[PDB]
Design a binder for this molecule. Structure first.
Ligand SMILES: Nc1ncnc2c1ncn2[C@@H]1O[C@H](COP(=O)(O)OP(=O)(O)OP(O)(O)=S)[C@@H](O)[C@H]1O
Ligand SMILES: Nc1ncnc2c1ncn2[C@@H]1O[C@H](COP(=O)(O)OP(=O)(O)OP(O)(O)=S)[C@@H](O)[C@H]1O
Ligand SMILES: Nc1ncnc2c1ncn2[C@@H]1O[C@H](COP(=O)(O)OP(=O)(O)OP(O)(O)=S)[C@@H](O)[C@H]1O
Lengths: 568, 24, 117, 625
């Protein structure tokens, strides 16, 4: 048969009972019965992301046919499924898509309409070089076709809602991603088949743990596909552990191992002060304030239409303000790369707003897009950084009020840019000398209140109304910034040990390095570039002459005013 | 005694689309 | 090479597939370049796709991620018989160990010696 | 057998000495041998961009097999160039080609690894008509084949490197484009061969000049083929000169037979002095041909003559007509563009530097920006240049830079990127220069363009090359890139009085610095600055336009004399210092061409007589006597 070339009988294996005992998605099967029992336009289409079990929907319908669970018009049918990926890939020249297509149509005309076909990827049917809309669209209107379509809404409206004549026959059935508990129900319907396959048992706490962690950590494939994948590969790993040279029940520990490879959340949120002092010395009260704000955001009491935390930052710049944002992005969500540094120094006009949010259509920066919102759309779990917010045009604060009120922002292009998953960091330096000159023996709280009144006279009161807490960023002493210089020396020695050199240092050399670029007016990065340009440049000058050997002890001994490197 | 059949050899082309811009 | 009929190469393919069904799971097969079986020129990939979706195939594939992503994942039944079993590039030390595995092979062929530095 | 029928040996013809000398390629033949006796991934394949001697390397390989400079493991080997089509030409039935291929494989196995196989153009045998490549592929994947390929990197990429099942059976033996001194050596051995062919003599400075000229000018083909083609066409030229006579007598021979045919067609003249003078010159040069009894060697000047008549750049000997025509080129630019000394100075000196060989060979010839208000002859000067150099007004690349006022008509002047609508029709500029590398490019009124067209002109006036959308590169470095503008028109018409030329140039150069890119103006060769015309210049232009009006009505059958007062009426009615020499043309057009054609279409004026354009009181009157 030509049916033995490109079609798949599922009533065959369902009469044998050799398919999935499909449990759930009853209403989608019901609406499929609604479309298929019409007189005309009897080709339903399934809409959803790939991997939602649409094949299982068709197979469960076939099982209801075999079980007799269908009304008396669906019986005697044969479930078929046509390939849309071989009718074109075999098609060399004119009429090999169409030849196979008409051969399929006539051989189903021999079948006399007692046949239900499946077709996935309805978008592929439109563009193949004309091809099939002009040859199935009669059968779409003849009713002799009993297709079952399956694609996603975005390809559906990109390709298929162009031609409305193709659109009027197929009937949209949304098949969304199932929930975690629906995944639990399906896997409990399918734990029996797994345990009869591998002759083992399965921990159902490990099932719900796998469902929850697959929902949280991994978003490549979706439910129920990823749960099936993780359960089957973990069962395979347990099967190899049994048949290596001992439990039959697959545990959630193996789930977490295959999860991270192929739990540190809650108490890491609880120990967030230690987390902020894992890399940043000093600013103890600011660390406590940030950690309390993080925990209160994770406490789940605030507005579900408002972001994680509204913040304004003050004090001397460059001392670790950006470094705080980097470590905050690291121990908040991932790493030191989900952040957008933004200078508010530029934006002082109306076309400043047209830059930063998004241009109106027809204008200069439109699909170049807004400077903020596009970068938010790319990185939906980040930390938003602002610089010199006092240099902003006043209408930008209306946009900021929309941020801190609604947690969302329509860009120039016209869509929704959600803000309830980021941290608004806005840095300024208005009360600089109020904190610098009065750093000595004045508290955190009343200095905060004093500079709060100062900025209250500076900014809008309704603007700083929305701000949760303004930390002080007191100027760190010589010991903290010396320790930061020591940490920079540690990571320098780490990279040179990657190059492979035993390197020591004099403590007087350490003091001169700490006193190269120490400055309370500019930040820590002058010290960084000072130590960098002093050490790095004569170093490789000594190296590539042919002086230094990997393995020689390199003490950074002092000169009278410099630092000399020795080879011992 | 076979004769080499001349083919049909379906081809392809594309087309861009510009976009002007106001300059306020 | 031993076939020149449209229905003798296919006859060989059908007979080997029926023998694979006959051996009852003892044969675990391997075929590199699965995309080449998709486009060899009924092409052989779509002829073995019933052996995919009849519970009889114990074969292994081998290709680049591009052909697996385009000629396989975009297909449906050809997707749901496989995984993203990724071949990693080895280390330099593993490469040196493999070179030690076949240093003596090249030396006995070319009548030379190979220094380990 | 089968190898005796469907293959062609090369080692026999190298043993018979029929193959050319192969010089150099020592590293390439050595790595050919290295890959050739490699155990796994045995079969080498040459990669060479077309011309660099892939077939020459395999010919030299067979010559070294006969010379015995191969190692002892490679002696007695035979190289059989597998003729792709000679397999095909009888396979009328089913699979008989496949039988021939399998039989060739069986006899090559019967030769037992004592025969190297040479398959030129392996991309032809990717699919050579399942059919050929997958049939060899098991014999590839047994180590039992000594196949040698040679294909250009385009085809090895797009036909072979796509199939990853084949890359584990071949090896990138990448030939490079040879250096010029390797080309010198190759040409010395082939000089021996070609002098043995033609019975001529080739000089070694002509070799090094052929190499340097071939590398410098013809940017299309690749070495060392183009040098060989120069030498070989020049040898044909010298043997033909020995054969009949030198080409100056042939110039005169074709000229007098031309005037013979056209004299017989005349059975008003402009004909008698030409025919008489060239019969005299043919007699004189036939006498000198008898007296010297010629060219019988090959100098480098013959190479320059072949290269000039191939590309079109005048690289040849600067004969006396060129020197006279060049000092007359200053004189004739003032014969058609009267006034405006600075422009004629600049362009004359530029083309004189170019013919003297002092031009920088990394830029185009002279890239001029023209300024000055409308109708002091900017486009007229450019037409005068093209109508000097090529003796036609429209023999030039006119690029009207006021059509490019969108950002994206750079697609017009350069080309369509690939796959798009009109892709295989190039640009206008890039195509029309890659046809004709010596031509004058008029970018007309550059200041109306969209400002990111000046990127393209930055690349042009930077190095004289340009990357069109079809990937290739153009050699602009024998063109004259003249642009026009008028961006200081108020300023130049203001201060041409009481300011010298340096201050004028610097001031309007600052205004242009406001207009253009400051990257762009420094990259220009020379910004010449114009001035509006005085009344005697306009009187001269009126005399020139009246010459061409006399020529227009001399075609029709009328003659004109003009008066002497009426030219003052043209010089005063058609005059203002603000719109150039065009109100002269409008005043001529009205005050002469309207009553004249009015009375001719009346039937009032009469042919054969003289139209004496005399004056009215404040009009111009025609008479007939
Ligand atoms: N209610 C259900 N009962 C049993 N198995 C189910 C159920 N829903 C989904 N599945 C399984 O989930 C998996 C999803 O695979 P598919 O059916 O291929 O998904 P899909 O919706 O068809 O999308 P694609 O594009 O085909 S991957 C299959 O192995 C199904 O058997
Ligand atoms: N090193 C060389 N020594 C001597 N002659 C050479 C050398 N390189 C090239 N030639 C000559 O230039 C020609 C070009 O060589 P080819 O290999 O034929 O170039 P090609 O691009 O391969 O053109 P095909 O592919 O063979 S049709 C040779 O046939 C020789 O005549
Ligand atoms: N020195 C000159 N010799 C001959 N014709 C001239 C001269 N100067 C101006 N012309 C006139 O210039 C007219 C137009 O030529 P163009 O070169 O286009 O004008 P232009 O003033 O050089 O500037 P544009 O930008 O092209 S309008 C012609 O019709 C000529 O009559």
């Amino acid at each position: 048969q030509a049916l033995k070339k490109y079609t798949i009988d599922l009533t065959e294996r369902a009469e044998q009972g050799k398919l999935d005992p499909v449990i759930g998605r009853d209403e989608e099967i019901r609406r499929t019965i609604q479309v298929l029992q019409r007189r005309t336009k009897n080709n339903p289409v399934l809409i959803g992301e790939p991997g939602v079990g649409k094949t299982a929907i068709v197979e469960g319908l076939a099982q209801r046919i075999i079980n007799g669970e269908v009304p008396e018009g669906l019986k005697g049918r044969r479930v078929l499924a046509l390939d849309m990926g071989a009718l074109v890939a075999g098609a060399k020249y004119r009429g090999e898509f169409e030849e196979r297509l008409k051969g399929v149509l006539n051989d189903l005309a021999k079948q006399e309409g007692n046949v239900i076909l499946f077709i996935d990827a309805l978008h592929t049917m439109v563009g193949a070089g004309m091809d099939a809309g002009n040859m199935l669209k009669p059968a779409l209107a003849r009713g002799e076709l009993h297709c079952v379509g399956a694609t996603t809404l975005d390809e559906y409206r990109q390709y298929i809602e162009k031609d409305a004549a193709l659109e009027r026959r197929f009937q949209k059935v949304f098949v969304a991603e199932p929930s975690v508990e629906d995944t639990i129900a399906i896997l409990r319907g399918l734990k029996e088949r797994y345990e009869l396959h591998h002759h083992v048992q399965i921990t159902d706490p490990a099932i719900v743990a796998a469902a929850t962690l697959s929902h949280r950590y991994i978003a490549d494939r979706q439910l129920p596909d990823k749960a099936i994948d993780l359960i089957d590969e973990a069962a395979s790993s347990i099967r190899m552990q049994i048949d290596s040279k001992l439990r039959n029940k697959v545990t959630d520990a193996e789930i977490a191992e295959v999860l991270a490879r192929w739990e540190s959340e809650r108490e890491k949120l609880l120990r967030m002060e230690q987390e902020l002092h894992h890399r940043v010395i000093g600013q103890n009260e600011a660390v406590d304030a940030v950690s309390n704000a993080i925990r209160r955001s994770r406490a789940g009491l605030a507005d579900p239409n408002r972001p994680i935390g509204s913040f304004l930052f003050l004090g001397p710049t460059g001392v670790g303000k950006t470094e705080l944002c980097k470590a905050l992005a690291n121990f908040m969500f991932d790493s030191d790369e989900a952040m957008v540094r933004i200078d508010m120094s530029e934006f002082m006009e109306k076309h400043s707003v047209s830059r930063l949010v998004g241009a109106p259509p027809g204008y200069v920066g439109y699909e170049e897009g807004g400077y903020l919102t596009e970068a938010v759309r790319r990185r939906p779990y980040s930390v938003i950084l602002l610089d010199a917010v006092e240099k902003a045009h006043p209408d930008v604060f209306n946009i900021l009020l929309q941020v801190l009120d609604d947690g969302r922002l329509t860009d120039g292009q016209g869509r929704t840019v959600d803000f309830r998953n980021t941290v608004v960091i806005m840095t300024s330096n208005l009360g600089s000398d109020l904190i610098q000159e009065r750093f000595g023996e004045l508290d955190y709280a009343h200095m905060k209140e004093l500079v709060l009144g100062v900025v209250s006279h500076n900014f809008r009161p309704e603007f700083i109304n929305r701000i949760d807490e303004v930390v002080v960023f007191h100027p760190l002493g010589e010991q903290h910034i010396a320790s930061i210089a020591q940490i920079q020396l540690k990571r320098l020695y780490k990279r040179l040990e990657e190059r492979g050199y035993e390197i020591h240092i004099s403590d007087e050399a350490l003091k001169l390095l700490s006193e190269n670029g120490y400055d309370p007016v500019y930040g820590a990065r002058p010290l960084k570039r000072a130590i960098q340009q002093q050490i790095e440049n004569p170093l490789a000058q000594q190296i590539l002459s042919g002086e230094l050997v990997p393995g020689k002890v390199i003490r950074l001994e002092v000169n009278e005013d410099r630092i000399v490197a020795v080879q011992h | 005694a076979a004769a080499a059949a001349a083919a049909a050899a379906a081809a392809a082309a594309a087309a861009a689309a510009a976009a002007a811009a106001a300059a306020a």
